[PDB]
Amino acid sequence: IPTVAYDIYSRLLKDRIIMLGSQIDDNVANSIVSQLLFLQAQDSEKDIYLYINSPGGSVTAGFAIYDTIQHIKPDVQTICIGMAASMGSFLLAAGAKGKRFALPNAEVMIHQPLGGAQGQATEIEIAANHILKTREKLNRILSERTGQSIEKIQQDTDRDNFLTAAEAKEYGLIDEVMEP
Amino acid sequence: IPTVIAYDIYSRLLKDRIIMLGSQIDDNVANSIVSQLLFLQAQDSEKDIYLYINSPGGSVTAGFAIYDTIQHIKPDVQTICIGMAASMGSFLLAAGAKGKRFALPNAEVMIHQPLGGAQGQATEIEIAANHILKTREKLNRILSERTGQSIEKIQQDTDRDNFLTAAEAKEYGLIDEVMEP
Amino acid sequence: IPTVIERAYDIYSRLLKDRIIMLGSQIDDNVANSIVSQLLFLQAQDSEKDIYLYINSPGGSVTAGFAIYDTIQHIKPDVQTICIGMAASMGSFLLAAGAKGKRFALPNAEVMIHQPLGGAQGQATEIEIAANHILKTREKLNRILSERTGQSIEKIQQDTDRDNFLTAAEAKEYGLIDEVMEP
Amino acid sequence: IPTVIERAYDIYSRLLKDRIIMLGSQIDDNVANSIVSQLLFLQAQDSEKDIYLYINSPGGSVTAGFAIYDTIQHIKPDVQTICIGMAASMGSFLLAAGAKGKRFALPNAEVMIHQPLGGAQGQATEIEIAANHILKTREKLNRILSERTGQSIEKIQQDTDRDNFLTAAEAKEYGLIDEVMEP
Amino acid sequence: IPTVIRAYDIYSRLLKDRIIMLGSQIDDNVANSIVSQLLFLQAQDSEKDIYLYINSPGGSVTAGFAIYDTIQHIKPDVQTICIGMAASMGSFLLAAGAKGKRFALPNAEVMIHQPLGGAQGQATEIEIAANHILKTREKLNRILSERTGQSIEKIQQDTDRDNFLTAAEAKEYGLIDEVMEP
Amino acid sequence: IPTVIERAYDIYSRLLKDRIIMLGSQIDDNVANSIVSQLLFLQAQDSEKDIYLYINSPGGSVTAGFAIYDTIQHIKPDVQTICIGMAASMGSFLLAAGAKGKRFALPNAEVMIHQPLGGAQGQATEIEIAANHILKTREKLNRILSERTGQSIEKIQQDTDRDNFLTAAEAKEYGLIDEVMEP
Amino acid sequence: IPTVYDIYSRLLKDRIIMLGSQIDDNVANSIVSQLLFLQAQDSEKDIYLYINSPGGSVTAGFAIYDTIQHIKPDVQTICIGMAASMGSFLLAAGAKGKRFALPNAEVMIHQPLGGAQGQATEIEIAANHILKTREKLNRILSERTGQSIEKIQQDTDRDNFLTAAEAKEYGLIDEVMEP
Amino acid sequence: IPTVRAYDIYSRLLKDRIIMLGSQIDDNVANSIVSQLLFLQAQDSEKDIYLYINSPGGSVTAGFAIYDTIQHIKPDVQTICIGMAASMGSFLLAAGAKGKRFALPNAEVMIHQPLGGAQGQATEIEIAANHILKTREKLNRILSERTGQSIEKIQQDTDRDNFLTAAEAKEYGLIDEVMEP
Amino acid sequence: IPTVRAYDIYSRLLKDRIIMLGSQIDDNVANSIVSQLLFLQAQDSEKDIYLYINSPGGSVTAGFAIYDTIQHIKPDVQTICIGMAASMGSFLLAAGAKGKRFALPNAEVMIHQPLGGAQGQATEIEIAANHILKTREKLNRILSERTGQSIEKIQQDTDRDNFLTAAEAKEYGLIDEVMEP
Amino acid sequence: IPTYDIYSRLLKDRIIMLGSQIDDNVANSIVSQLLFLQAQDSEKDIYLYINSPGGSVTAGFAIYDTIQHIKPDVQTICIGMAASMGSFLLAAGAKGKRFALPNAEVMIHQPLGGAQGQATEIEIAANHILKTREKLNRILSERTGQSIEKIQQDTDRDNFLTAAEAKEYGLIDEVMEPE
Numbered sequence A: 001i002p003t004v005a006y007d008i009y010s011r012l013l014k015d016r017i018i019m020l021g022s023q024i025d026d027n028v029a030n031s032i033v034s035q036l037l038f039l040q041a042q043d044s045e046k047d048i049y050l051y052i053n054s055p056g057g058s059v060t061a062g063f064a065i066y067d068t069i070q071h072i073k074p075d076v077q078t079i080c081i082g083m084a085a086s087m088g089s090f091l092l093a094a095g096a097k098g099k100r101f102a103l104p105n106a107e108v109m110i111h112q113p114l115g116g117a118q119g120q121a122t123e124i125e126i127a128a129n130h131i132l133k134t135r136e137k138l139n140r141i142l143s144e145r146t147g148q149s150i151e152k153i154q155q156d157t158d159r160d161n162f163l164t165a166a167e168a169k170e171y172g173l174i175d176e177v178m179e180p
Numbered sequence B: 001i002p003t004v005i006a007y008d009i010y011s012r013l014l015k016d017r018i019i020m021l022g023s024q025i026d027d028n029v030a031n032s033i034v035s036q037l038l039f040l041q042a043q044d045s046e047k048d049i050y051l052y053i054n055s056p057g058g059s060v061t062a063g064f065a066i067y068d069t070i071q072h073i074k075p076d077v078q079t080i081c082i083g084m085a086a087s088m089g090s091f092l093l094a095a096g097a098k099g100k101r102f103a104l105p106n107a108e109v110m111i112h113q114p115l116g117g118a119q120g121q122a123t124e125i126e127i128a129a130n131h132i133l134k135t136r137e138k139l140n141r142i143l144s145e146r147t148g149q150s151i152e153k154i155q156q157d158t159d160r161d162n163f164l165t166a167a168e169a170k171e172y173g174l175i176d177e178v179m180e181p
Numbered sequence C, D, F: 001i002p003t004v005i006e007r008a009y010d011i012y013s014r015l016l017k018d019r020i021i022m023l024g025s026q027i028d029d030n031v032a033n034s035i036v037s038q039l040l041f042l043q044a045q046d047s048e049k050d051i052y053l054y055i056n057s058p059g060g061s062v063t064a065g066f067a068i069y070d071t072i073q074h075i076k077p078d079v080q081t082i083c084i085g086m087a088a089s090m091g092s093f094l095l096a097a098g099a100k101g102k103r104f105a106l107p108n109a110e111v112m113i114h115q116p117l118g119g120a121q122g123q124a125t126e127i128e129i130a131a132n133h134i135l136k137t138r139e140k141l142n143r144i145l146s147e148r149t150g151q152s153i154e155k156i157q158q159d160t161d162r163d164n165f166l167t168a169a170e171a172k173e174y175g176l177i178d179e180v181m182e183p
Numbered sequence E: 001i002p003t004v005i006r007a008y009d010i011y012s013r014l015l016k017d018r019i020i021m022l023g024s025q026i027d028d029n030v031a032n033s034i035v036s037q038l039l040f041l042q043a044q045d046s047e048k049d050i051y052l053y054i055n056s057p058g059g060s061v062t063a064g065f066a067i068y069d070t071i072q073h074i075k076p077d078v079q080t081i082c083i084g085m086a087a088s089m090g091s092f093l094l095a096a097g098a099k100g101k102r103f104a105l106p107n108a109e110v111m112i113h114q115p116l117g118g119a120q121g122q123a124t125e126i127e128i129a130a131n132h133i134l135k136t137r138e139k140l141n142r143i144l145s146e147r148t149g150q151s152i153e154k155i156q157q158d159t160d161r162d163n164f165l166t167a168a169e170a171k172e173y174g175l176i177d178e179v180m181e182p
Numbered sequence G: 001i002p003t004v005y006d007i008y009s010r011l012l013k014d015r016i017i018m019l020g021s022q023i024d025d026n027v028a029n030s031i032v033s034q035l036l037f038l039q040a041q042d043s044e045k046d047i048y049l050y051i052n053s054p055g056g057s058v059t060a061g062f063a064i065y066d067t068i069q070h071i072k073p074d075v076q077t078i079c080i081g082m083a084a085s086m087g088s089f090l091l092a093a094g095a096k097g098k099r100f101a102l103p104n105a106e107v108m109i110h111q112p113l114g115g116a117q118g119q120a121t122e123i124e125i126a127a128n129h130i131l132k133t134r135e136k137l138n139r140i141l142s143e144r145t146g147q148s149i150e151k152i153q154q155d156t157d158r159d160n161f162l163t164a165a166e167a168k169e170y171g172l173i174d175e176v177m178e179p
Numbered sequence H, I: 001i002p003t004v005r006a007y008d009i010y011s012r013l014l015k016d017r018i019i020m021l022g023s024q025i026d027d028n029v030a031n032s033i034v035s036q037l038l039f040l041q042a043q044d045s046e047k048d049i050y051l052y053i054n055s056p057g058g059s060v061t062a063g064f065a066i067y068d069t070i071q072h073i074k075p076d077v078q079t080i081c082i083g084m085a086a087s088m089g090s091f092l093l094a095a096g097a098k099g100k101r102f103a104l105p106n107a108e109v110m111i112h113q114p115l116g117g118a119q120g121q122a123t124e125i126e127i128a129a130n131h132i133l134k135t136r137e138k139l140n141r142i143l144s145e146r147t148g149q150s151i152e153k154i155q156q157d158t159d160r161d162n163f164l165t166a167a168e169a170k171e172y173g174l175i176d177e178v179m180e181p
Numbered sequence J: 001i002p003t004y005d006i007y008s009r010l011l012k013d014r015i016i017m018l019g020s021q022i023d024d025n026v027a028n029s030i031v032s033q034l035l036f037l038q039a040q041d042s043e044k045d046i047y048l049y050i051n052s053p054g055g056s057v058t059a060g061f062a063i064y065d066t067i068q069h070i071k072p073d074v075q076t077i078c079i080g081m082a083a084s085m086g087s088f089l090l091a092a093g094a095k096g097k098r099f100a101l102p103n104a105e106v107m108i109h110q111p112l113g114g115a116q117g118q119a120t121e122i123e124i125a126a127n128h129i130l131k132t133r134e135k136l137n138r139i140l141s142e143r144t145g146q147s148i149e150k151i152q153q154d155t156d157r158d159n160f161l162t163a164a165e166a167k168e169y170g171l172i173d174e175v176m177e178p179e
């Protein structure tokens, strides 16, 4: 809301800080991707800081952000404040290795995909196969980014799983709890 | 609606062993049809029963409650399609006693695959998908037995909604005769 | 809906004269009130002849289901249970509650077992009370299902974690019914 | 729902002929008016034979519940109370109100006790009047529950501060019922 | 709901014994039914008294006065018995029973208050509505004064805000004659 | 609602046997059709005995009210009118329409008189037609009220310009009724 | 609303942040961004956080709480009107010695609120989570007020409204600001 | 709405130390008014501030945020009622610097007791009742101090809604002067 | 809407001391009109101000905020009715500087009594009735002073909605002149 | 929409675009534009394009009286449709300078309105709308040269005119042919 003429977020973007503070939908992803591409074009070596306070959102919107982070040359540090849940915790784990952080009282939640399907049996089968493939894709990447096996990630996401920042570090979702 | 000298018109027909299925098939309709079938069997276990069907279909489990009761009881159940028998309605039409399944000449018969829905976690969507796929296999297997068509042909012919005339339904094996005037 | 000559009965009242009770809907307090009243009435008419309870039900209220369950176990007549269509959730619990040896399903009937569902809103303390209550309810259901099926409580817990759909033949193998009724 | 041969009764009317009243819903003014009328009718038919009140109820209006409570205490016949399913809130209050020695629950029935719920909107003065009224109502309920259970008022106050779910066996130990009815 | 052995519903069966059950809000339909039952019972026997059970949150003031005036008009005594709650026009009808024959059960509640209403429109119309509801309050207070023995000034003070009474307090107030014990 | 023994009447049918008609609602076409039919039926049963019309009504449709009014004036029996509760608008018009000397109100009944209400939308020409119609309707009502009360048309016009609430005693002084019925 | 900058941007130039609404993720995002911006402008000067808030999301509140504790400047907190629920938690989170309330401001403390629907297993997970959240809040309130965890648990079982003077006696603030 | 660099009309008045309170008082309005008061004090801690009030009232805690800020800052805050000051609006009118509280001649002032609501368990309703009763005592005590009336008189005079003319508000002590043309 | 640095059309007219009242009168509209009047007085306390009125009326207290501000400030406020001035709109039309109240020839002026509502206990309805009756007396007294008609005539003429042409409004004393082309 | 916005750019050339229903907001804007243009130059004429289904009669008369009051001629040009108060404003342009494009439509009709309440109030509303119709017909008679009786007959029901018929009727002076 406040102005500094920049709004406060535009002012932070000048210092290569991107604030992800909402549900992740296509509009949010389009804006975050555009900010990442802009920052890379301004300086391809300096790293970028992505703050995450997000309950999650669209899996495809989340993957648009995820792939852009992996594509660009700068390191993207990720910093969880408040909560990173679902695709939010997936993006937290996607930051540059060694540069994934959470503040001490931040929460991290991991779970399996949610969705819906209606229609003929054939269509329900297509939707089920699609969401199951999506879960396998997410688990495989989380395995690579955390060092946990795919079987452990599958077991640990069967139901909603809430982690403290310290537990998220032990799990491999972040590298450090940021102390004051 | 009307009363006859006192029965409503449907109660009067039930006295002559006629059951009128003229709506969507839900649990209340199935509970009533099953109860009428059991009552008629208890009144006379040898005389057959006449089930008129004008129905767009409805709940698959409600339809199977009626289907299994028809197969369970001793009397033959003749089935007579007037208007339309679609989805579980055409399944019940095909379930009548062999040789005693009829449609009137302008009645329509429609066959299709099951419809349903699922929401929730991936695991729950998978459970719902497996369930509706097993339900389709169960329906196709019975339709194969009652029509003489192979399961593969029934699967192909129900992939999309398939509307049949009474004459086509007879050629298909869903009914035995088109009832002429 | 239809009426039958005799005075006059609706079709369900006519079946009740032959000791048949039709459970063909979701189980709520009104349905349980009616089923319990029919069971008590039939016992008062004849305490030795058995009763036939047809079940086509997606389930419903757990406490309404237990009102029916306890009445079945309380009265002197045997209650045979016959699943047509579907017995899910408290419906499959009542199916398994019939007199041992007299629990049936028709060949294409479906049986579904699952864990309790519920909700809670309010202060942390209130959510804890609701969670403890629904967890105790699940343990109570599993313990009775274990007794009526012969499966261990641990197996019932594993098999109800997610919705579990059984064919009539599988329900017999599981111990939820005694026989698949053939034509 | 079903009808019974005799002329013709619905199932509840048939049970009422045997002095059985079925309370199987939320308690509102219409339900209380019907239950009170049935109690007065049964007393007028025979002032000595007792009456059987089955309770499966989540509770409801406190004043409707007290209409039933006071009628039970007023009439000459004993009123046995039998909990099936659940007796919660004013339902458990009416369960505890049955004739001493004749209050029962089936083994898997649940009993829940709690404090009154209500609401108030308006000027500070009006909110104060509503608060005083609901606090007096709670004291009235606790005092009667103390008399009918033998627990002290202080224990009832502590045990109803939050929703308190009891098994039938716990309800007997508490003094809300006299016996768990076994098969 | 239930039927009794031709065939009566439970309320019709009680009406045969001269019992009328007022168990709802008082609107024009309820008043029309209660008035009709009172006239019917008087026509059946003009000497035997009538029993009016009251469990009511109140309702329309004019519907309540239709019942009130019919009670005062007919020859039989009308006993009134509060169970549960008699609030607003319900407590007014409770106090209207035959003197000496107004009762409440021990845990019944009685609530008295001033009239409620609404008005919208021109200043002139709001004034007409205000004058009407103020005259209605004076009419109610005057009758309550006569039936309870309290002064009009005390009734006015005691109804300014909602006033909840126990059965024992309602007896002390003069709204009923006796708390009915078991 | 209640039924009375004899065959079987609802309470209103039982009163109609004694030539009592109960007008206890808003006056719409369905109510007027029923009241007119009852008046014609009672005249056909006995053309000399009078009829008793109880009125507790907020009013309603002017044309439905005139259907009742003209039927009262047409038939041979006297129709006594008795206001209980409230007779407002077309209700007070029908109260004043009873047989002269046989129009009553109970002591706390209220009588309200006012001018017609209505609405109109559309072209100027259509609004003019609707205005002329409702003004003619008011003149028709005032002329009849003048005849039945003995007040001049000018006084009735002044006294109905705004809603005018009368006590039973004031309604008698006005000429809308003949007597306040005392106990 | 008014321009001078809008009025809030003008106050932010003097290191004043105005928290005047329910605390949701958007509000927390903005407050955190303002705190980081002010630290980057000057890491030594303190910051003034005015609080008039009925509370809101617990995780949004902790985003603000952890940012306050993380940055180098002291954050003074000043309650005007009401600080309830996570609002009173943030009031108590200000730099020790620099937590204030105006004399007629109200402070309310309570336990977490939430909801859960679904299978028994899911309700259990939600109950365990909200109970752990309450323990986390109580432990921090104990540290910031000097009251024991058992006293905070007892005093938050039901909604507990405090005057500014009572909030000072409790340890939620350091001083009632007089005129 | 209109513009007068560029200011909207309210921003232009704020440059002359005029704050316009012309709506219900909620948390957003209080946040803005408090911010304007702090800004004006920072610009000049000696010149007084003019607060125009046309408000039906609103949140009691939002009103106290404004009230305490007025009492806290160094400048005098003159208050000027135009139209209506009701409920927390009349409380803020009475809160202006003593001698500098005004109403225009046809402005209305209304005083009343707090309004609120509560739902839930008896214990929770009791907590809400105690809270709103303490809030009323706090308001009455301050109104007593600012008007010179006793707390008992304020309690009696706010039991029901009490509408005052500007002249009556001056006689009551809620304002110091009726502003004449 | 249109722009003319850069002003919207209303801001451009305000530079020439013209205020356009073209809507229902609520608290937001009154707050804006009052602010414009105070701003114009501060710019020049001698030049008069032109208030165009096309308004169906609105809140009585919002209308009195504008009325009292007009009477308070030093400049004359000319009032010019275009289209319609009804209810508080016609009250503000009559409030312009004497000799400087105008209507265009086909403009309409409507006068009536206050409208309002009340719900609740008898005591509360009485308080609301007394308040709206006092409000009507206040309006009638001022209209009497500004038109030269007696209070009794204004009371009779506002009992029902009373529509006046511009020429009739001049004869009545609500305006001084019909503005001719 | 496009960028001055396009309408502000046309207003610089003394063109006002009336392209919507006529309500109080539209009339206030059109009146303000007319007064502004007169103040800029009291001799040059003004061009008012009209594509409007009509709207409020009093809002329409605010525009009508302002047109007649100001010194510049106001040319009126109908494109698309001028119906009800729209056709009234079309006929109100400077005599000789009222135009329609060849496929534009002009519709004339009687006033529409509504009334609810007591008989006395319905009578007041009926008298008011009948006086409004007489006022409109009298002005249309003056601006078209048709008698009041003919205008009354021709507006009893909705009456749709082509541009050529509107010229023959006297509502416009010329059908504008292509350039």
Ligand SMILES: *O[B@]1(*)=C2[C]=[C]C(F)=[C]C2=[C]O1
Pocket (backbone or CB within 6 Å): A056, A057, A058, A059, A085, A086, A087, A088, A090, A111, A112, A113, A114, A115, A134, A138
């Ligand atoms: O939560 B989370 C989610 C949701 C949905 C999807 F699809 C996916 C995912 C991951 O995380």
Ligand SMILES: *O[B@]1(*)=C2[C]=[C]C(F)=[C]C2=[C]O1
Pocket (backbone or CB within 6 Å): B057, B058, B059, B060, B086, B087, B088, B089, B091, B112, B113, B114, B115, B116, B135, B139
């Ligand atoms: O149509 B139809 C159907 C539907 C659903 C299901 F589930 C199944 C079926 C068969 O047919």
Ligand SMILES: *O[B@]1(*)=C2[C]=[C]C(F)=[C]C2=[C]O1
Pocket (backbone or CB within 6 Å): C059, C060, C061, C062, C088, C089, C090, C091, C093, C114, C115, C116, C117, C118, C137, C141
């Ligand atoms: O499904 B099912 C259910 C539901 C709910 C509860 F609580 C329980 C149960 C069992 O089954």
Ligand SMILES: *O[B@]1(*)=C2[C]=[C]C(F)=[C]C2=[C]O1
Pocket (backbone or CB within 6 Å): D059, D060, D061, D062, D088, D089, D090, D091, D093, D114, D115, D116, D117, D118, D137, D141
């Ligand atoms: O739950 B329960 C209840 C509710 C409400 C009231 F008031 C009371 C009570 C008791 O229980």
Ligand SMILES: *O[B@]1(*)=C2[C]=[C]C(F)=[C]C2=[C]O1
Pocket (backbone or CB within 6 Å): E058, E059, E060, E061, E087, E088, E089, E090, E092, E113, E114, E115, E116, E117, E136, E140
């Ligand atoms: O409550 B209650 C009431 C209401 C309303 C009116 F008018 C009256 C009364 C009495 O009581």
Ligand SMILES: *O[B@]1(*)=C2[C]=[C]C(F)=[C]C2=[C]O1
Pocket (backbone or CB within 6 Å): F059, F060, F061, F062, F088, F089, F090, F091, F093, F114, F115, F116, F117, F118, F137, F141
């Ligand atoms: O009220 B009332 C009325 C209404 C309407 C019309 F038309 C008429 C009348 C008479 O009364």
Ligand SMILES: *O[B@]1(*)=C2[C]=[C]C(F)=[C]C2=[C]O1
Pocket (backbone or CB within 6 Å): G055, G056, G057, G058, G084, G085, G086, G087, G089, G110, G111, G112, G113, G114, G133, G137
């Ligand atoms: O109020 B408050 C709250 C709410 C919710 C949660 F979760 C937490 C908390 C603290 O405070």
Ligand SMILES: *O[B@]1(*)=C2[C]=[C]C(F)=[C]C2=[C]O1
Pocket (backbone or CB within 6 Å): H057, H058, H059, H060, H086, H087, H088, H089, H091, H112, H113, H114, H115, H116, H135, H139
């Ligand atoms: O009105 B007013 C008010 C409301 C609410 C609260 F809480 C308070 C107050 C004061 O004024």
Ligand SMILES: *O[B@]1(*)=C2[C]=[C]C(F)=[C]C2=[C]O1
Pocket (backbone or CB within 6 Å): I057, I058, I059, I060, I086, I087, I088, I089, I091, I112, I113, I114, I115, I116, I135, I139
């Ligand atoms: O219209 B108008 C009006 C309305 C309302 C009020 F209060 C007032 C007035 C005057 O004018």
Ligand SMILES: *O[B@]1(*)=C2[C]=[C]C(F)=[C]C2=[C]O1
Pocket (backbone or CB within 6 Å): J054, J055, J056, J057, J083, J084, J085, J086, J088, J109, J110, J111, J112, J113, J132, J136
């Ligand atoms: O259309 B049009 C119109 C409408 C309405 C009014 F009032 C008027 C007019 C003319 O045209």
